[PDB]
């Protein structure tokens, strides 16, 4: 460990927006933390990014203002960024920089960890099999998820995704309720939440919701407003992810990370790239943002020899309700699945307006079946899905021509669409439904058709369950 006095320089050679270029620094370190002292005396921090001979550049996490070519000092610790982390972080609140904001004490660290963390060896990773209860009807049964499974939430401006996040974080539970309840109740879910580029109103809505739940015994909150500087957002997610790693792989608990507004992260990275004059990719975003999103989306899954788990549940906004926009596409190439909250459903006041049609959850493949959830599950979702798609086709054909050309089968499809939207989609504010109930509701929605119409269902299962 380092056992030498710190070092200080004063040669400042320019400021280019959120960057500060400087000269005559001996033996610097790439990715090294720098402190700053202003003429007025305030303190600041930064990160060395570029290095070339004696000249080096940094990035002030809180912007540049009042800096001077000769009346500002800088200090090089000659060490990679080491963050503090303890189990005591539960129940606390902080800003992006990690300093307290809720009047509480300074951080009292249990250990120093690396911001970049480390690349986990894939062989230790245990493939998830548990299927987590969500309470939501659209996610359970149809696009379910697992413990350790990283799923995003696609949404847009003005959509009510915030309370969807509230619901999914509040109604967390396990679906293995068919056994003794006492051993079931031992399990809880530590939550770590990292606001980022989020206005005051949504932040207070979330903290009031958490206070209503009374779950601050196991909630860590990192906060960011709009008025704060922008470059904090470059490092804000990583702090939360590292703390989640420590709370999972060392404290043995089950953690659930929440990330907010990744398009803001992309915007901040693009701003840094615009300052850094590197080669721009499509829509001006740097080429290596793919690898950056990879590095921030891989800290998930459980590991051998332990029993904790890490589930990634980010939310991101699509400008102009676009799907081929860069950030949605690249996130689709990193994350395994999608949800696609839709504006059209929200226009007719259906809450939550979850569009099942473009959704996907690959890891449903082995997360369901006899013993896990129910003998007869997947084909029900497939039949409902194909019926929904064909019903939407019939709806389009009705729009093009009119009800005159529709057959009786088309009428059956249309009433299926109506009932499907009315019952299965619409749930309500705090309607915590069970898995068996949603399966029963699916069977109910299937009942309207006779045996002949269904095509993607085994006849044995139909004879087993349909006649009741």
């Amino acid at each position: 460990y380092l056992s030498q006095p710190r070092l200080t320089y004063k040669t400042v050679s320019g400021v280019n927006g959120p960057l500060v270029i400087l000269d005559h620094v001996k033996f610097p370190r790439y990715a090294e933390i720098v402190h700053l002292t202003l003429p007025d005396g305030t303190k600041r921090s930064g990160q060395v990014l570029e290095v070339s001979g004696s000249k080096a550049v940094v990035q002030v996490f809180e912007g540049t203002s009042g800096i001077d070519a000769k009346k500002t000092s800088c200090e090089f610790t000659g060490d990679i960024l080491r963050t503090p982390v303890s189990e005591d972080m539960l129940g606390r609140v902080f800003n992006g920089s990690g300093k307290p904001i809720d009047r509480g004490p300074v951080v009292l660290a249990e250990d120093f960890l690396d911001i970049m963390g480390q690349p986990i060896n894939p062989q230790c990773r245990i493939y998830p099999e548990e299927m987590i209860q969500t309470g939501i009807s659209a996610i359970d049964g149809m696009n379910s998820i697992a413990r350790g499974q990283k799923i995003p939430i696609f949404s847009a401006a003005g959509l009510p995704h915030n309370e969807i996040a509230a619901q999914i974080c509040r109604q967390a539970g396990l679906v293995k309720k068919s056994k003794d309840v006492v051993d079931y109740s031992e399990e809880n879910f530590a939550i770590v939440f990292a606001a980022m580029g989020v206005n005051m109103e949504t932040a207070r809505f979330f903290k009031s919701d958490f206070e209503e739940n009374g779950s601050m015994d196991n909630v860590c909150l990192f906060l960011n407003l709009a008025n704060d500087p922008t470059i904090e957002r470059i490092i804000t997610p990583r702090l939360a992810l590292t703390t989640a790693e420590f709370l999972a792989y060392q404290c043995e608990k089950h953690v659930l990370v929440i990330l907010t507004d990744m398009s803001s992260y992309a915007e901040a990275l693009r701003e840094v790239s615009a300052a850094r004059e590197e080669v721009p990719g499509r829509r001006g975003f740097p080429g290596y943002m793919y690898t950056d999103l990879a590095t921030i989306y891989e800290r998930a899954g459980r590991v051998e020899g332990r029993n904790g788990s890490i589930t990634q549940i980010p939310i991101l906004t699509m400008p102009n309700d676009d799907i081929t926009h860069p950030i949605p596409d690249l996130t689709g190439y990193i994350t395994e699945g999608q949800i696609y909250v839709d504006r059209q459903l929200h226009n007719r006041q259906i809450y939550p307006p979850i569009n099942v049609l473009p959704s996907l959850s690959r890891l449903m493949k082995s997360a369901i079946g006899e013993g896990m959830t129910r003998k007869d599950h997947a084909d029900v979702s497939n039949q409902l899905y194909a019926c929904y798609a064909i019903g939407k086709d019939v709806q389009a054909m009705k729009a093009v021509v009119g009800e005159e050309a529709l057959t009786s089968d088309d009428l059956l499809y249309l009433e299926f669409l109506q009932k499907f939207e009315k019952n299965f989609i619409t749930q309500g504010p705090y309607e915590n439904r069970t898995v068996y109930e949603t399966l029963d509701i699916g069977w109910q929605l299937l009942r309207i058709f006779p045996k002949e119409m269904l095509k993607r269902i085994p006849q044995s299962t139909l004879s087993e369950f349909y006649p009741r």
Binding site: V15, T64, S65, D68, A274, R283, A399, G402
Partner: protein, 600 residues
């Protein structure tokens, strides 16, 4: 201490021999001492965005330095005056020059130092008592409507040693003096405040009271809260500036601040000519609304970079009056001009464009600019309660709504309103789309609307349902020629047409409907919904049993009644008391009931 020019390129000037420099530090350049601000420094060189057109600065010109950033002055006399982007009172210049032109970079004081004003002490503060920053101690009456209040500036405290007795004093006359450690420091009635720094507050607070909207639409359909954020993107032709004028003219707020970003001086011409004429009273004597409004004019002929400054000064002024313990609704016009100016300063400084040619940091800047808002609790012993709302206006590049600025303003704002070219083409004033527009504050206002009116929800839900159904059936009836339509469809589409051409259409310039109150609006909507419901049940029952009531025969029966329901908006509430209006509404309701009983 001084620098010399090296090069110039329109609104940017590179300089030399300026090692003692700091960004966002004010400066002066040339023999005309034009004001500027540092934006780039490297070696001994630098660059300055100049707030005045630079035809007349050559190389080698002096570059004077100061030590304070961009700043403004707050105090009595600001109310009722007109300012430009960097706070010059236009009346003083027109008096001094006795001309009709702006000389390039005139050095005038922001606030006159030659007018004396009465002063009132705190009446509870004595020499020796301790006070903290943010406490009101003096009252000056700018005019009969507003009682200006002065509070100790932040980062100041200690025990007072002297307070001016009651009497008349000017700005230069020292009034207050405090010591906290053993040092005496004086304080006048004018406050120097940096523009880019947020004023501290105590804590934030939600919305509870509705912001008044003159138009029946955007109040009963897409309301806004007193302290929230609104956006009004709309292509040319509509001239939504008039909607901004209607908002400023009538409002339940206390102070209104209008700012201009690159519009025409004619907008100023209407507002300055009209506001002295307009007058209203609250608790007695009647005073012109000019005494409760402040203007910041900036036409497009003005320098490019000045616009950013102008917006920032606007938010600063509204913040100071927020600390006063009031409600202040501001409307900023043509933020796209600010975006273009920022694009231009960046492009001249040769950065790398991010999207649509605009810089890489427009989003964060716009978000921070909008973030200065909301209803909060002031920091003072008299425990004031302030509030501020913003009405930003967006100018789509050609009407296309996929522009980056429009998406950012949509993503940051809480209330969004839609303007459609065809609706403005219809002369359907105002051109609210009611399809993409939405709000997110109906839930908060439900408590107020239930507590004070006790029936708005069924009306709203049924209105939304009718509008959605009409939108669904529009192209359907277009593509089937209204041939095989049930009576229900015909009643729905025709009552929707009635709602469109009566309840939504509202000419805000005819004298009888320049302004509409909430009670009249809900009365209108109650009458319309009752008519629709009674017609629906009547036609349903008659079709079910026998002698189906088609639209033609009921129309023949009630042509006179629907004509009155169309012409009922002709009320002129200034000439018609509310009691008579509601009596006439009950009279029309019982007329409709009597006709419906006459049918059955």
């Amino acid at each position: 201490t001084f620098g010399y020019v090296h090069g110039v390129s329109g609104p940017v000037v590179t300089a030399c021999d300026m090692a003692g420099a700091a960004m966002y530090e004010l400066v002066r350049v040339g023999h005309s001492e034009l004001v500027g601000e540092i934006i780039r420094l490297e070696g001994d060189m630098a660059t300055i965005q100049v707030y005045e057109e630079t035809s007349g600065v050559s190389v080698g010109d002096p570059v004077l330095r100061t030590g304070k950033p961009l700043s403004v002055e707050l105090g009595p006399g600001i109310m009722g005056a007109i300012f430009d982007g960097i706070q010059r009172p236009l009346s003083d210049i027109s008096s001094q020059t006795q001309s009709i032109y702006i000389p390039r970079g005139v050095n005038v004081s922001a606030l006159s130092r030659d007018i004396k004003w009465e002063f009132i002490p705190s009446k509870n503060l004595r020499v020796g008592s301790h006070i903290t920053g943010g406490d009101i101690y003096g009252i000056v009456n700018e005019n009969s409507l507003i009682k200006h209040k002065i509070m100790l500036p932040p980062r100041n405290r200690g025990s007072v040693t002297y307070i001016a007795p009651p009497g008349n004093y000017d700005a230069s006359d020292v009034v207050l003096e405090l010591e906290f450690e053993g040092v005496k420091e004086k304080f006048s009635m004018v406050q120097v405040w940096p523009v880019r720094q947020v004023r501290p507050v105590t804590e934030k607070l939600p919305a509870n009271h509705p912001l008044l909207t003159g138009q029946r639409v955007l109040d009963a359909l897409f309301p806004c809260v007193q302290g929230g954020t609104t956006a009004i993107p709309g292509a040319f032709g509509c001239g939504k500036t008039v909607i901004s004028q209607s908002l400023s003219k009538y409002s339940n707020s206390d102070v209104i601040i209008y700012v201009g970003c690159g519009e025409r001086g004619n907008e100023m011409s209407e507002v300055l000519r009209d506001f002295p004429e307009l007058t209203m009273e609250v608790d007695g004597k009647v005073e012109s609304i000019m005494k409760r409004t402040a203007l910041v004019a900036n036409t497009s002929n003005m320098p490019v970079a000045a616009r950013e400054a102008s917006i920032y000064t606007g938010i600063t002024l509204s913040e100071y009056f927020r600390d006063m313990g009031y409600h202040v609704s501001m409307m900023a016009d043509s933020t796209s001009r600010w975006a273009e100016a920022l694009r231009e300063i960046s492009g001249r400084l040769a950065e790398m464009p991010a999207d649509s040619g605009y810089p890489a940091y427009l989003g964060a800047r716009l978000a921070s600019f909008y973030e200065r808002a909301g209803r909060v609790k002031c920091l003072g012993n008299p425990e004031r309660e302030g509030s501020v709302s913003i009405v930003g206006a967006v100018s789509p590049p050609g009407g296309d709504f996929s522009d980056p600025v429009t998406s950012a303003t949509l993503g940051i704002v809480q209330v969004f309103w839609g303007l459609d070219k065809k609706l403005a083409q219809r002369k359907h004033f105002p051109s609210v789309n009611w399809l993409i527009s939405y709000s997110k504050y109906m839930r908060a206002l439900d408590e107020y609307y239930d507590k004070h009116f006790t029936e708005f929800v069924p009306l709203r839900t049924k209105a939304k349902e009718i509008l959605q159904e009409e939108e669904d059936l529009a192209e359907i009836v277009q593509l089937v020629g209204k041939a095989s339509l049930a009576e229900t469809d015909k009643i729905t589409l025709e009552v929707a047409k009635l709602i469109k051409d009566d309840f939504l259409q509202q000419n805000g310039y005819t004298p009888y409907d320049r302004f509409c109150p909430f009670y009249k609006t809900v009365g209108m909507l109650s009458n319309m919904i009752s008519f629709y419901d009674m017609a629906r049940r009547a036609v349903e029952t008659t079709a079910q049993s026998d002698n189906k009531i088609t639209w033609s025969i009921i129309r023949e029966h009630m042509g006179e009644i629907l004509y009155k329901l169309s012409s009922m908006k002709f009320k002129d509430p200034v000439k018609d008391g509310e009691a008579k209006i509601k009596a006439d509404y009950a009279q029309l309701l019982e007329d409709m009931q009597n006709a419906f009983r006459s049918l059955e």
